Write a protein that binds this ligand. Structure first.
Ligand SMILES: CCn1cnc2c1c(=O)[nH]c(=O)n2Cc1ccccc1
Length: 127
């Protein structure tokens, strides 16, 4: 029932890049999802205490959320786009595993995911 430490968002010894695909992930993908009306549950790590989800971290071993991804993008955490695309996919998967089909949180994730898949379809060519 306690919250774990958050996912890592700073590591000076992790090598990094700034790249046109990573810039697209921030300016197009993250921004598009973040401004959506259903973003709010996904904008920060799950607070299992606040939300009364005492089993959440027993089930979900690789937590991920858009607050973390926004910090990873803004803090230049990544080496490549794959890593950031994987974070989005982990966030959606976690929601589909934890919750019941058709629960409001699930519909919310499916709506975000639709937009995510469209933007990823459109990923720019690597410069
Ligand atoms: C996506 C992470 N997350 C944030 N809040 C959540 C969840 C979750 O997986 N399951 C949940 O039950 N809630 C609570 C919640 C349900 C419905 C709408 C809003 C918040």
């Amino acid at each position: 029932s306690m919250n774990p430490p958050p996912p890592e968002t700073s590591n000076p010894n992790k090598p990094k890049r700034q790249t046109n695909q990573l810039q697209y992930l921030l300016r197009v993908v993250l921004k598009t999802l973040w401004k959506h009306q259903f973003a709010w549950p996904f904008q920060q790590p799950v607070d299992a205490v606040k939300l009364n989800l005492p089993d959440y971290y027993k089930i979900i071993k690789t937590p991920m959320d858009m607050g973390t991804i926004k910090k990873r993008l803004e803090n230049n955490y990544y080496w490549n786009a794959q890593e950031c695309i994987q974070d989005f996919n982990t966030m959606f998967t976690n929601c589909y595993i934890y919750n019941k089909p058709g629960d409001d949180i699930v519909l919310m994730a499916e709506a975000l995911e639709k937009l995510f898949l469209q933007k990823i379809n459109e990923l720019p060519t690597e410069e």
